[PDB]
From a paper:
Cytochromes P460 oxidise hydroxylamine within the nitrogen cycle and contain as their active site an unusual catalytic c-type haem where the porphyrin is crosslinked to the protein via a lysine residue in addition to the canonical cross links from cysteine residues. Cytochromes P460 consist of a homodimer with one haem P460 per monomer.
The optical absorption spectrum revealed a large spectral shift relative to the as-isolated ferric form consistent with successful reduction. Instead, a water is 3.1 Å from the nitrogen of either pyrrole ring A or D, with an additional water 3.1 Å from the nitrogen of pyrrole ring C. Residue Lys78 only shows the single crosslink between its sidechain nitrogen and the γ-meso carbon of the haem (CHA carbon), not the crosslink between its CD carbon and the C2A carbon of the haem. However, after collection of the X-ray diffraction data (0.20 MGy dose), the peak shifted to 451 nm.
Residue numbers in the entry:
A (entry chain A), B (entry chain B): 18 to 161
């Protein structure tokens, strides 16, 4: 498997098979993103158990560069895979970063992100803004 | 159970638990979309067996109106759920519409779309542009 993140978090195996929580696009990143979760995170998302999210929930955000469909040029679609971002809920273990273990792996090569074991402070620079929602921006997409 | 589509196709049960094939955004629709598939479709997508897609593959496209995150205005995120669009592969049964059974259900109330049993001719009006790719536009997103 890929190397662990600098804070010791291992890449969750088989995350590409996880169920969908939502999707997004960031104007400044020129990307498309999928937000998936493990079974605990998906149950929590669906039942609104996000105040706080329960221990063991793992969220993944997958990002691709925007590209356009040759046969349909107004369709913005995934190009190159850029990264997999994770948040692992463990209120006690990760109390210093809002109860979440942050980790990122870059590209198809799955290179662990971060200069040192303190790298998650970057993530917290933005995710602190979402403190009222237990540090999670994503609102689970509505489905029947 | 939601009413069947005008061509007799029943709403696939449990589609929200299906694995991710990709995501998209249509500039003219002001939306965000997820593309999921049943496990027949997902295996085909991952192995590149999409010439043609195997019988029994079901693709679903879920659409939400774009909305912006209150805490991060440049993050385009799902608002209202607009529709679930399906293609069910059955080369023999749906030979008249490219080997796919098309069907759409609207909104959280899951109202079947289509004026009459011939509604899928609309879908074909665009999807015929993709005939050389077995009537499917989506290129499965790349993941490691
Ligand atoms: C999305 C994210 C997710 C999904 C959970 C969530 O909080 O919605 C993960 C697992 C993750 N990020 Fe964070 N991120 C930001 C925003 C606004 C969103 C929601 C909109 C969207 O889908 O794009 C996020 C913002 C930021 C940010 C501000 C510039 C930074 C610096 C980060 N994110 C950093 C990180 C991480 C540090 C390595 C990390 C593991 C993240 N994000 C995980
Ligand atoms: C996406 C779609 C999917 C996913 C499979 C695929 O072909 O990619 C389904 C199940 C579906 N649609 Fe079709 N559709 C169009 C385009 C360009 C894309 C790819 C880009 C994206 O993700 O947005 C599609 C185009 C059109 C179109 C041209 C204006 C029409 C009229 C339709 N689509 C119509 C239908 C349906 C008729 C009711 C139907 C069941 C569809 N699409 C299913």
């Amino acid at each position: 498997e890929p190397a662990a993140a600098p804070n010791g978090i291992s890449l969750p195996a088989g995350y590409k098979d996880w169920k969908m929580i939502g999707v997004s696009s960031r104007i400044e990143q020129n990307n498309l993103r999928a937000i998936l979760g493990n079974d605990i995170a998906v149950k929590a998302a669906r039942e609104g158990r996000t105040h706080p999210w329960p221990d063991g929930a793992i969220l993944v955000k997958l990002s691709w560069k925007k590209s356009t469909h040759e046969l349909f040029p107004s369709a913005e679609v995934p190009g190159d895979f850029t990264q997999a971002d994770f948040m692992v809920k463990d209120a006690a273990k990760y109390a210093s970063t809002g109860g979440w273990g942050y980790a990122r792996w870059l590209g198809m090569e799955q290179k662990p992100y971060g200069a040192n074991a303190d790298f998650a402070q970057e993530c917290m620079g933005c995710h602190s803004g979402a403190k009222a929602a237990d540090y999670v921006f994503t609102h689970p997409a509505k489905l029947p």
